[PDB]
Symmetry: C2
């Protein structure tokens, strides 16, 4: 069936021991394809200690026979505005964040990394001229960072669109424009990672909260996915033990409809900090079994 | 009335212009006491750019007539395990995290900073020997960091207990132990900031999920609070337009019962990222109006 994976966001703060985490993904989840989260080792940490730990993960995962296909921004990263921030200095700290995340990913010998693109201030979000001026700087920064990433040995970067009018890209049309702006201008490809819970967010996208609309405008650029359960009313990141609009069969039918091959459906499931480790692990296991029960 | 303040977590990613943020707290929320969040300027950022931005917020708030009483950890910070992490290198990254936060706080001329103490890994959380080993290192770290803070001009550090058995301090008994261990050993005081949603978390604390139990074991050490609305079943951080067990009047009755004076009740309200700016702002204003509506004895 569908190529399933897991983003390690479920394990944040909890199963930190590299061999224990690899074993959990292999033996408990029965999954092979992994996306490593910045929420395990912060790009900003001094590089010696950061990379020592990130490399320990990379080694443990290789040894368990798992494939870390990419690293990706998480909640610590998403807290700040990065490339669409309201000052050049803050946008340059976005450059430096991603530059450092690229270094860490190269230390892991992982081929790709990505993140949401960034976020406008409240004032800037309301001002199209301001948005475009900021964006032009951001777009040039990603050209330079693609070149850097290529020199570090990476093969691809990703941008993850978001369900916010105050950020970019939000809509399938926004993502199409970003992808056109970068295509033929970057030394390695910059592609889209589309999160099902973002695309299906109804309050912002209404009748365009629809994955066919994403394929219509963006199919050729979508290189990977985040999957999660949601009611379409907030970005839930629920597991597949929970009810909502993203049934496992809906996922498998999309997979088959578009003849997908290597565009990993990474489960990106978030738990409240205060949930107990045993309950999170049980839930994650039942959730993966629910996903694997879809009929191809 | 009770001493209300606001933690700037509600503004993260949104009202970032320093004078607009300051004016919003002053004019729209009608408040004076502020807790600045690490979520606006990351302690890890390079010092020069980091302090330029942090200092711009400090100056704008001071000019608007607001008092930034402390800086405090937010979600970016809480993502990591820090002082209770399973390797000494990860613990040392927690040390450096707070050291850098102290640098940023001194640059702002803010007198105090704090955060939750840190977090055990899943394996270590179940090994009392490991917990003890890790904690003894953590405690020694905070001693050194209190010495550094004093040298940088700070007056106080805070630890925020949390509603997880995998972290310490969690219970009022944990918090009393940490406080007792550190009292007389630190060059400036290390005190508790208690979040009403953490103390009132029922699934962990059962009948000890209430604030009188916190005063019974910890009163002398609780120097500030986070207030939020909650149903007591998860750590909600709801605003005071929402139903739940932490009513404005209950907060005012607690404030009067214990003769509190300067121990600021900072509203710490969390909004989904995807909520619209104007909806967050409207709700925050109605929430602060609800809090001000409480009736003092
Ligand atoms: Cl572990
Ligand atoms: Cl703004
Ligand atoms: Cl440092
Ligand atoms: Fe996602
Ligand atoms: Fe809190
Ligand atoms: Mn999301
Ligand atoms: Mn909390």
């Amino acid at each position: 069936g569908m190529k399933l994976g897991v983003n390690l966001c479920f394990a944040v703060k909890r199963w930190l021991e590299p061999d224990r985490l690899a074993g959990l993904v292999r033996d408990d989840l029965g999954l092979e394809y992994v996306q490593y989260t910045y929420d395990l080792t912060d790009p900003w940490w001094p590089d010696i200690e950061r990379d020592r730990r990130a490399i320990a993960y990379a080694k443990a995962f290789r040894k368990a026979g798992l494939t870390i296909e990419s690293t990706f921004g998480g909640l610590a990263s998403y807290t700040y505005n990065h490339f669409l921030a309201p000052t050049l200095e803050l946008q340059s700290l976005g450059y430096q964040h991603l530059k450092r995340a690229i270094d860490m990913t190269a230390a892991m010998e992982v081929p790709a990394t990505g993140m949401p693109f960034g976020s406008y201030s409240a004032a800037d979000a309301l001002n199209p001229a301001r948005r475009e001026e900021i964006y032009a700087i951001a777009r040039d920064m990603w050209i330079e960072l693609a070149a850097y990433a290529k020199r570090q040995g990476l093969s691809m970067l990703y941008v993850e669109p978001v369900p916010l009018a105050t950020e970019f890209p939000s809509s399938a049309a926004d993502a199409a424009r970003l992808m056109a702006d970068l295509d033929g201008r970057t030394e390695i490809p910059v592609r889209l990672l589309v999160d099902w819970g973002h695309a299906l967010f109804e309050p912002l996208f209404g009748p365009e909260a629809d994955m066919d609309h994403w394929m219509d405008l963006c199919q050729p650029w979508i290189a990977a996915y985040h999957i999660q359960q949601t009611d379409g009313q907030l970005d839930r990141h629920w597991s597949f033990t929970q009810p909502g609009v993203v049934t496992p069969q809906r996922l498998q039918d999309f997979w088959d409809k578009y003849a997908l091959t290597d565009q990993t459906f990474f489960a990106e499931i978030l738990y409240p900090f205060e949930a107990r480790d045993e309950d999170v692990l049980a839930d994650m296991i039942a959730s993966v079994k629910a996903l694997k029960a879809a009929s191809p």
